């Protein structure tokens, strides 16, 4: 079954439960209340996003059952995003201990400082749910 | 494509005597329903259903350039199978198709455009419900569907 | 989730940010109109769509003579012994075998599932 | 006559209402034309059936289909719709009584005929669309028997289940005792026989 | 008081002819029409026909106010008739037949894209993004 | 000052009017006896939590019609007129809607049958000709 | 088809209008269908029995006639109406 998991084509659309685009310009004050508990962990010592980051944010929820059934964890997924998009996307994600798997995405500070700052998150999202392969 | 996959599935009307099927919102615009609410009220009867709303979003965005009934008719007429050599001929041609050629059983009188929009809205509503899976697809083999 | 229309032209309102103040605003295209956004969420899609079918089921199915009826599941709201049961009927449910019940008593559109 | 009658029963015209009323009301279609909406489809359908059964304003070949789960009432008056007569069952009881049979026995010198059954509202034509909404008892002798309790809402009963057969298939004896491909071959041979 | 159980019955009168024909003008709830701000208004037949069988144009306060278009109700009432009952001091209702019915819709006022600009910017549709930019260009 | 100017007194004074739906035969009799001004009486009865509308046709004209009221909140209706002197006016706003129905039902279907039979007279049907045209 | 469709089609067809300038109008008005009749070589019409149609290889047809009204206008504010009965 491990080999099957490595053979079977898996995309984020298979492991994600739901996804939403949130507008929260200041990451220190997440519009999602529950994110603040875990997002504060990362934004306590921000890196590469201290100066600037996209005010828009894409939040993805992943189904634990599909994730565990495919033996997929957030680590390689977050890396696979940066493996696909490069450093274009600041990708930040909650601990495995959380009831729901959450990863937070913003467009890079230099692109904020490629098509648009907001709507291209739909291009990113739909591409991540379609072409991006885990 | 990034933009294509960002907009996704979108609705086109295959009208008679027209070379390329127009975005469905243009037919409502051509019927005279200008604002998005006037059009969506005929498509979505319960605005509290976000799924239907998200399914119509790309159709509204595609039509956005056409914000006038005369422009939609000129667009329909310039897409006519016999293009009119001038905008006035194109608009009268497009009106004649929408008056007699499209949905004749609903009506052919010059004031039946309101009833045609409701039935066209219902055709879209059925397509949306089918795409959303709330209603099963019609069966060609069902003899109730035969004559 | 909520859709807003321009109060002037009844056209769709689109989310926008003011670089001057950095706040979400619903701006009307072709209309130079903007409105104060409140939900702060511009888009959401449920891939697994774990929506409860009880919301979609219609109380009028209690009148369908082709639906089965059972006296073993009394309605909680009114105590009526007879109830009407059926399956999901939604094509997106890849596993639709659970039974949804609706009270057979008139004007009592109570619905539940075992 | 249907469209005129619907105006009597407050069916709201599409051109005289706001779309917000369409959510709760039921769409009324006639021959595929969306005529309007109605807020009390149950009383309307009962009235339509009663009028059809009485042959007052609606002829027997008109079919009324109510999609209860979809708030739609479709009335089809067009030609070419295949339909068949079915006995009406109410309160788990046949509307057909010995008086009707006796009158049908006394068919000669009495002018009582099939048309009197339709006019009596004892039997009605059900088309393929309306059959979807019909709960049909195969026989009154066992399907509508309270002891079986399989279904307590039969709306119609088959006159005789053998009437599903055609002309050539009705010549087969005991077709229910033959393999289905053999009933097909006889249906061809019966057309090739001599007599 | 009596209002809890009041019963009123009035005679009905139907004039044979009236100097002014009665018509129904209906507006949608979303139109939010307000007559207090209508300091001036114009109701006249349209110009697209280039009369009794043509749409109506409704304009408020000249060019400054809102514009509406009235379209005749296509569905005839072969088995129905409409009458307007008005209160009268003599205790009798006077009914006027609805000679015509017109449904009015508001017309937006802004820099609408012309047929030529649409025939031009249709070229965008193959690759359109960030539609706000089209209005900034216009 | 223009030909199209509307006399908005109906709107200014907020004159309220009732839109009532009645059968063609009923209004036809009223139009025939219009010169009498005694076509009938309209009775309205209100109770603690219920009100009903009904009309009684004059005996001579006939030789009870309960009315069902309908909501006016779903669509704003107004009444306007055009004077023969080319002067438009707004009579008022529709404040109540009602519909006429007959009290009886079985005998009422007889009238409908008579109307159907009368309506069949103009429906021309192919005539069988006993002898060929010579 | 005969009782209704035939008459509806005849009535549904738009009246022919012709312009020179005198104006002419043709309006179809009523359909009549005679019993199946056969015309002998001499031209004598006779009722056709189906047995005869099968035997003589005839076509069992009914003569179809229609009432037509012709109105002419000669720009002199006057119209002449002529009706061709059972054409
Ligand atoms: Zn706007
Ligand atoms: Zn209950």
From Swiss-Prot, chain C:
Zn(2+) 2 binds at residues 75, 78, 103, 108. Signal peptide: none annotated. A zinc finger (TFIIS-type) spans 71-113. GO terms for biological process: maintenance of transcriptional fidelity during transcription elongation by RNA polymerase II; transcription by RNA polymerase II; transcription initiation at RNA polymerase II promoter; transcription-coupled nucleotide-excision repair. It holds the Pfam family Zn_ribbon_RPB9. Coiled coil: none annotated. It comes from the Eukaryota. GO terms for molecular function: DNA-directed RNA polymerase activity; nucleic acid binding; zinc ion binding. SMART domains: RPOL9, ZnF_C2C2. Transmembrane segments: none annotated. Zn(2+) 1 binds at residues 6, 9, 28, 31. CDD domains: Zn-ribbon_RPB9 (cd10508). GO terms for cellular component: nucleolus; nucleus; RNA polymerase II, core complex. A zinc finger (C4-type) spans 6-31. Keywords: Acetylation, DNA-directed RNA polymerase, Metal-binding, Nucleus, Transcription, Zinc, Zinc-finger. Its main location: nucleus. It is found in: Nucleus, Nucleolus. Belongs to the archaeal RpoM/eukaryotic RPA12/RPB9/RPC11 RNA polymerase family. Component of the RNA polymerase II (Pol II) complex consisting of 12 subunits. DNA-dependent RNA polymerase catalyzes the transcription of DNA into RNA using the four ribonucleoside triphosphates as substrates. Component of RNA polymerase II which synthesizes mRNA precursors and many functional non-coding RNAs. Pol II is the central component of the basal RNA polymerase II transcription machinery. It is composed of mobile elements that move relative to each other. RPB9 is part of the upper jaw surrounding the central large cleft and thought to grab the incoming DNA template. This is DNA-directed RNA polymerase II subunit RPB9. It comes from Sus scrofa.
Swiss-Prot record, chain E:
It is found in: Nucleus. The modification Phosphothreonine is found at residue 114. It comes from the Eukaryota. Induction: Up-regulated in response to enterovirus 71 (EV71) infection. Phosphorylated on Ser and other residues by TAF1 and casein kinase II-like kinases. Belongs to the TFIIF alpha subunit family. TFIIF is a general transcription initiation factor that binds to RNA polymerase II and helps to recruit it to the initiation complex in collaboration with TFIIB. It promotes transcription elongation. Heterodimer of an alpha and a beta subunit. Interacts with GTF2F2, CTDP1, TAF6/TAFII80 and URI1. Interacts with GTF2B (via C-terminus and preferentially via acetylated form); this interaction prevents binding of GTF2B to GTF2F2. This is General transcription factor IIF subunit 1. The gene is GTF2F1. The chain holds residues 5 to 180 of 517 of the full protein.
Swiss-Prot record, chain F:
One of its GO terms (molecular function) is DNA binding. It comes from the Eukaryota. It is found in: Nucleus. The modification Phosphoserine is found at residue 126. GO terms for biological process: positive regulation of transcription by RNA polymerase II; transcription by RNA polymerase II; transcription elongation by RNA polymerase II; transcription initiation at RNA polymerase II promoter. The modification N-acetylalanine is found at residue 1. Keywords: Acetylation, DNA-binding, Nucleus, Phosphoprotein, Transcription, Transcription regulation. The modification N6-acetyllysine is found at residues 21, 32, 121. One of its GO terms (cellular component) is microtubule cytoskeleton. Heterodimer of an alpha and a beta subunit. Interacts with HTATSF1 and GPBP1. Interacts with URI1. Interacts with GTF2B (via N-terminus); this interaction is inhibited in presence of GTF2F1. TFIIF is a general transcription initiation factor that binds to RNA polymerase II and helps to recruit it to the initiation complex in collaboration with TFIIB. Belongs to the TFIIF beta subunit family. This is General transcription factor IIF subunit 2. The lineage of its organism: Eukaryota, Metazoa, Chordata, Craniata, Vertebrata.
